[PDB]
Amino acid sequence: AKQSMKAREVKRVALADKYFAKRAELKAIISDVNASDEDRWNAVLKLQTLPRDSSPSRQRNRCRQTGRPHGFLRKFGLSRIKVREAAMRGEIPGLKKASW
Amino acid sequence: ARIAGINIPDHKHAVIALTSIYGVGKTRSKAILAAAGIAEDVKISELSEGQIDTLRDEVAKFVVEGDLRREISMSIKRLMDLGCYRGLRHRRGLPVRGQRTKTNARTRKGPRKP
Amino acid sequence: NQYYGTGRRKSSAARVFIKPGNGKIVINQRSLEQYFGRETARMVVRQPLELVDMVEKLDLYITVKGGGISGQAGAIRHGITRALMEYDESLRSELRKAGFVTRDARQVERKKVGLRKARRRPQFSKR
Amino acid sequence: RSLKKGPFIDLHLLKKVEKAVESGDKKPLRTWSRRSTIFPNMIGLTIAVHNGRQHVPVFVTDEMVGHKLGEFAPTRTYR
Amino acid sequence: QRIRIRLKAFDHRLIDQATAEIVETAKRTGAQVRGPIPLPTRKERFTVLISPHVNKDARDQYEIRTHLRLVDIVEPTEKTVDALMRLDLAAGVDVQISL
Amino acid sequence: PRRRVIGQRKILPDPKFGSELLAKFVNILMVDGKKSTAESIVYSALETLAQRSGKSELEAFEVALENVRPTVEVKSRRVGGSTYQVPVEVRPVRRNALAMRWIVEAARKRGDKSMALRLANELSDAAENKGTAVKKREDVHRMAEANKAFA
RNA sequence: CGGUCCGGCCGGGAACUCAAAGGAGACUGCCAGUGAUAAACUGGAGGAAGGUGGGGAUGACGUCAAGUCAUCAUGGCCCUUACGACCAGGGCUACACACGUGCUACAAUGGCGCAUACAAAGAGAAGCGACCUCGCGAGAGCAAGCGGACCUCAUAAAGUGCGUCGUAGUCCGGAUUGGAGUCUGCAACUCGACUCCAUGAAGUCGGAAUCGCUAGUAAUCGUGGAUCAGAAUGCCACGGUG
Numbered sequence: 036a037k038q039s040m041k042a043r044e045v046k047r048v049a050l051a052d053k054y055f056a057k058r059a060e061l062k063a064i065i066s067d068v069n070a071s072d073e074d075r076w077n078a079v080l081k082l083q084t085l086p087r088d089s090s091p092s093r094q095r096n097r098c099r100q101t102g103r104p105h106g107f108l109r110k111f112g113l114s115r116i117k118v119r120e121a122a123m124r125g126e127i128p129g130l131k132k133a134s135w
Numbered sequence: 136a137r138i139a140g141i142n143i144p145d146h147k148h149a150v151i152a153l154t155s156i157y158g159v160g161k162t163r164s165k166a167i168l169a170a171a172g173i174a175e176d177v178k179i180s181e182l183s184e185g186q187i188d189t190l191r192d193e194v195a196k197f198v199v200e201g202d203l204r205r206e207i208s209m210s211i212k213r214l215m216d217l218g219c220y221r222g223l224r225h226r227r228g229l230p231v232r233g234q235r236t237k238t239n240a241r242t243r244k245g246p247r248k249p
Numbered sequence: 250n251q252y253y254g255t256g257r258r259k260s261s262a263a264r265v266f267i268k269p270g271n272g273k274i275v276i277n278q279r280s281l282e283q284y285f286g287r288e289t290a291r292m293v294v295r296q297p298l299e300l301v302d303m304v305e306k307l308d309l310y311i312t313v314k315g316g317g318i319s320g321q322a323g324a325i326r327h328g329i330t331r332a333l334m335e336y337d338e339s340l341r342s343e344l345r346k347a348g349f350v351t352r353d354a355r356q357v358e359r360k361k362v363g364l365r366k367a368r369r370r371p372q373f374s375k376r
Numbered sequence: 377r378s379l380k381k382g383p384f385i386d387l388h389l390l391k392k393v394e395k396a397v398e399s400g401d402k403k404p405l406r407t408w409s410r411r412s413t414i415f416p417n418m419i420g421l422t423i424a425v426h427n428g429r430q431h432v433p434v435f436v437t438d439e440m441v442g443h444k445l446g447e448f449a450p451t452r453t454y455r
Numbered sequence: 456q457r458i459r460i461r462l463k464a465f466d467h468r469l470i471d472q473a474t475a476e477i478v479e480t481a482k483r484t485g486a487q488v489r490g491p492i493p494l495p496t497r498k499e500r501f502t503v504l505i506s507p508h509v510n511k512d513a514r515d516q517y518e519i520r521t522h523l524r525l526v527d528i529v530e531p532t533e534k535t536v537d538a539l540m541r542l543d544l545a546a547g548v549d550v551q552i553s554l
Numbered sequence: 555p556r557r558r559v560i561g562q563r564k565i566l567p568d569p570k571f572g573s574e575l576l577a578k579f580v581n582i583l584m585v586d587g588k589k590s591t592a593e594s595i596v597y598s599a600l601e602t603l604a605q606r607s608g609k610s611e612l613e614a615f616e617v618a619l620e621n622v623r624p625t626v627e628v629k630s631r632r633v634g635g636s637t638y639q640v641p642v643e644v645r646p647v648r649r650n651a652l653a654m655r656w657i658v659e660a661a662r663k664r665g666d667k668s669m670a671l672r673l674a675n676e677l678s679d680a681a682e683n684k685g686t687a688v689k690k691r692e693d694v695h696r697m698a699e700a701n702k703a704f705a
Numbered sequence: 706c707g708g709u710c711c712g713g714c715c716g717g718g719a720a721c722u723c724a725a726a727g728g729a730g731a732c733u734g735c736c737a738g739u740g741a742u743a744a745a746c747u748g749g750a751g752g753a754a755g756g757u758g759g760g761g762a763u764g765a766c767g768u769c770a771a772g773u774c775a776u777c778a779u780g781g782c783c784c785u786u787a788c789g790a791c792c793a794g795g796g797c798u799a800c801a802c803a804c805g806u807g808c809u810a811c812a813a814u815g816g817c818g819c820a821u822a823c824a825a826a827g828a829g830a831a832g833c834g835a836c837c838u839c840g841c842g843a844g845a846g847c848a849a850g851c852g853g854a855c856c857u858c859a860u861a862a863a864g865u866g867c868g869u870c871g872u873a874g875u876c877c878g879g880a881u882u883g884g885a886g887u888c889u890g891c892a893a894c895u896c897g898a899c900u901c902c903a904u905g906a907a908g909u910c911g912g913a914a915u916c917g918c919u920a921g922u923a924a925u926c927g928u929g930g931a932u933c934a935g936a937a938u939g940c941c942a943c944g945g946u947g
Contacts, residue, residue: 036776039790056831059891069381070846080387082891091831092890092934103776107932108501115503116776122517128547129465133500133518134761135359148869151876160903161817161876162841176869203903207883217439219447220894229800231882233896236800242881242906248801253721259921260825260944264722286822286865287590292569314722317823317945318864345752352753355921357825358760360942362502363512367760369923372916374805379887386892408794411892427895428795446894452799471726493725495854500827501931502941508773511940516762522725523854555919563920583814586925587947590864591814662814667871669814 036102044097047088054089136179139191140200149182150175153190158199167193252336256328258353261316265328267336268308275310276325290322297330300343307336323353378413385412389445393418406431410446425449456531460539461551462524470522473544477526480542484534489527497521570597573612575650582654583673598670603677618680622653622687626698641698641705653687660686 065078087093096107098114106115111127122130137143144152153164168175171189173182198206214222224231230243241247252267274281274294285291311328313321330349334341344350358367365371378384386409396402397417404422419438424431427449434448460477464470474491481488498520505515528535544550568577576596584592603618604611628639644652661673663686679685 055891060831063890066382076382079382079384079891080390083387085891087891090891090934096932098776101776105932106504106776108503109932110499110501114776116507118501118517119503119505119515120777129519129521130517132762133498133516134763148876151870154876158903160905162902198903203883207904210883213439217437217443219440219443220450221447223450225882233798234881235798237798238800240800240881244800246907251720255722261823262722266721284822288569289566289589289593293566312722313823315824315944319946321823350753353921354754354759356759357921357944361761362514362516362941365917367922368918368920370917372806374916377886378893384892410794410894412894426794444894446794449895451795451895454799467726491726495724500942506773507776510772514941516941524725558919560919581947584947585814586863587923587945588814588863588925589947595814665872667813 036097036104041097041102044095044102047094050086050089051091051094054085055091059085059089136182136184136187138187139194142200144179146178146180148175149173149177149179152179153194156194156199158197158203159194163197167197252332254328254330254332254335256324256326256331256352258323258327259316259320259356261313261320261324263311263313263321263324263328265309265311265325265332267329267332268310269306271308272303272305273308275308277312285318285322287318290318293322294325294329296326296347297333297344297349300347301333301337301340327352383413383415385409385415393421396421404433407445410444410449412445414440414443414445416441427451456554458528458531458536459553460526460528461553462526462548464522464545464548465519466547467520467522469545469547470524473548474524474526476542476544477539480538481528481535484538485530485532486528486535487530489529491524491526494523494525496523571612576612576615578650579615579654582651583658595669595673599673599677602670602674606674607678607681614681615677618657618677619650619653621680621683622656622691623649624652624691624694625649627652627694628697628701638704639697639701641701656687656690660690 059082062078062082065072066076066082095104096109096112097104098107098117099112100117101114103114103116107113108115108118111118111121113121118127121127138153138156140156140158142156144155150161150164150168153159153167154161159167165175167190171186171193173186173190211225215226216222221231228244229236230240234240250269254265254267256263256265276284281291281294285294309329309332311325313324315321316324326349330344333344334350341350360366361368363370386407389405389407389409389412392405392407393415394417396405401420404424406424406426408426410425414436418436419441421436422433423436423445424433425445425448426432428451432449434445440448462470462473462477464473471491478488478491498518500516500518502514502516504511505513539552565574565577565581567574568580580589580592580596583596600611600615604614607614607617624644626641627644629642631638631640657676657680658673661669661676664672664676666672666675676685676687680687
């Protein structure tokens with residue numbers, strides 16, 4: 036995709052590692068827990084005040100090369116197009132064409 | 136014999152026949168015929184007149200017929216008059232629960248016009 | 250003495266021991282009648298004991314994994330008939346002619362990219 | 377529906393409403409919070425909720441409480 | 456003690472050189488070796504669309520086979536732990552070692 | 555097919571009777587690969603048959619079947635516009651297939667309760683020859699004799 | 706073979722299934738006949754398999770200025786206080802209509818209720834999540850195990866047996882709408898899925914026309930996966946019956 040849209044998926048990873056991965060993983064338990072406090076949550080109102088792109092929900096996967104949003108494959112971190120280009124040169128190990 | 140709703144079921148089985156009330160399905164049924172202590176296979180003819188007036192009291196717990204028809208109609212009217220989304224969909228005859236209208240809303244729109 | 254056969258059909262794989270002496274059919278520690286609740290599946294495990302003789306002549310203890318009913322049946326059929334040819338030998342002539350010796354090669358055809366199943370194409374439209 | 381551990385509102389709406397209840401009723405609030413459950417303490421006010429271009433005046437009745445704010449600004453024109 | 460070695464690797468000729476080293480290396484330095492028993496073989500499968508834009512029935516089905524081998528050693532000498540630790544194999548083999 | 559002249563598959567005989575011709579009848583009656591429940595229906599409606607037409611269970615079938623079996627059919631054939639129904643003398647094997655198939659399309663059409671009723675009553679009426687499966691065989695023997703000209 | 710809490714569970718066994726490496730096997734090789742003594746063909750034997758045994762992968766020179774500058778690359782043209790860049794809300798989900806591809810139906814070869822059997826192939830650490838406890842249910846609480854032939858997802862369903870419904874727009878059908886919930890998620894109004902109670906449309910096998918299939922095929926029955934916080938009637942794969 037664009038250079039802007041690849042820059043946006045560094046910005047959204049930068050946050051969600053810093054914040055939610057520690058600090059919102061506290062507050063999602065304080066908003067959960069029924070057998071401790073049912074009045075001084077405060078935390079639901081505090082979860083908004085965190086920057087919005089701290090949520091991992093907001094992260095799309097791109098193909099770590101061309102930046103393409105659709106056609107992703109998690110094992111390889113790549114679009115279906117670049118998987119195949121790389122497969123056939125022999126750059127993905129053990130991967131061959133199948134038949135059965 | 137007629138039930139606490141101003142209705143008259145048939146000579147089927149009983150759990151089925153109580154479904155014939157507006158406001159009673161198959162779950163309420165089996166729920167009623169139980170508390171009253173009737174077997175559910177048993178018919179309406181082959182049921183004594185103490186065993187029918189126990190049912191009249193049981194179905195008087197639940198909101199049924201012109202209690203219910205009103206209760207629905209009044210709830211729909213809150214939406215229509217208040218002018219929320221769901222009101223605006225009720226009053227145009229379009230589907231309310233987010234279904235597509237480009238094709239297929241044919242229950243909710245009626246047979247079709249050129 | 251224990252006379253052995255393997256047999257297979259579809260995903261089923263039966264293993265079949267033949268003892269001398271009597272009528273009796275075991276199959277995953279159940280009666281033949283308990284295990285197969287369909288008449289069609291019964292008179293294919295017995296089939297080979299008809300061309301070759303049994304009323305009360307050999308017991309058989311068998312076990313079977315995988316497939317479903319009529320798969321498991323056919324594996325056992327073939328499993329017996331391997332084990333008969335272990336024991337007697339010169340029954341092959343008669344068994345071959347009914348063709349219970351032929352391991353049945355038919356697997357399910359795989360499903361194929363483009364198609365709804367193995368061969369079922371989607372509905373074509375010219376225009 | 378938001379399960380019964382929470383109902384939801386934006387802080388920037390909550391605190392702007394606490395003001396114009398406490399101080400006294402006024403020219404209407406301009407929110408973009410369409411996603412925010414109308415509470416009991418909002419009744420009487422005019423809130424002007426964003427439909428996607430125009431903010432649209434909504435006089436908050438008693439009967440509205442529980443519904444979301446976005447339900448009273450429609451987004452799409454139609455005839 | 457039981458130590459057991461799960462070898463796994465994408466190439467089936469590369470793995471059973473690395474096995475046959477380890478079965479030799481243990482027997483020579485005084486031990487009773489078990490296996491090398493073949494476990495089953497995770498074959499993954501990826502279908503992919505093959506054109507850059509459209510043509511949904513044009514596809515290319517790839518696989519990765521992962522071969523897997525297990526070698527139990529029942530009698531360790533003090534040499535036999537260090538003889539196998541010091542060993543170095545090809546790059547495409549992954550060794551493990553439980554205790 | 556053009557080149558590909560071919561053999562054909564050994565069906566198993568029927569487990570109760572040993573009747574190879576009756577196995578073909580459960581196949582013809584089977585739907586959705588449920589041979590189980592075809593056999594239930596057939597074995598039933600031969601009990602209901604053979605009881606009510608003086609016994610023999612193989613041969614209450616084979617009297618009802620012998621009645622619907624055809625002997626000629628048409629075979630439409632273009633010459634240069636108008637289309638000539640030619641009578642043609644039907645094979646030994648295809649006699650049964652057509653018979654069996656017509657019995658069942660007749661049985662599947664009636665308005666009795668079970669299928670094992672419906673079948674039993676269109677094997678009753680075959681053997682005392684009325685009902686739709688022989689009204690089919692008669693309106694095929696019309697077409698062969700009406701177009702006897704053309705052979 | 707011994708012993709048993711009747712469980713391959715525990716001594717043990719290395720036979721059998723299975724696992725995945727290495728080999729053998731099928732070549733018109735052998736027999737007869739047909740044929741220009743040819744190539745081959747028709748039949749037979751033995752064989753697990755017989756005449757390319759079944760399935761895939763493998764797509765000649767070229768054809769349509771076919772498709773894709775929005776995966777990527779790229780010649781030229783163009784914009785450069787905007788056609789670039791950041792944000793919140795909306796939209797891509799609109800609905801008088803027309804077409805395509807699917808799913809569910811219209812029912813006794815069936816529907817509902819109670820018991821009961823037989824698969825394969827997969828996935829799993831910001832993950833799969835047992836047991837036990839709470840909830841009508843979706844789920845919740847607690848918490849072993851498992852980077853996994855070990856543990857979890859995970860009870861296959863058609864089937865079978867026993868009961869019941871009686872040809873009725875019905876105990877067929879589930880659309881739609883009301884009420885109340887559950888979960889994921891900063892957030893389910895626009896616009897998620899799933900549960901419970903209620904509601905119970907059309908539909909009684911479809912005009913002209915038209916599609917798929919030659920065998921483990923069609924038909925029918927469930928199972929898994931990728932994408933994915935959540936969102937499969939689609940897609941890719943797996944076995945059952947047949």
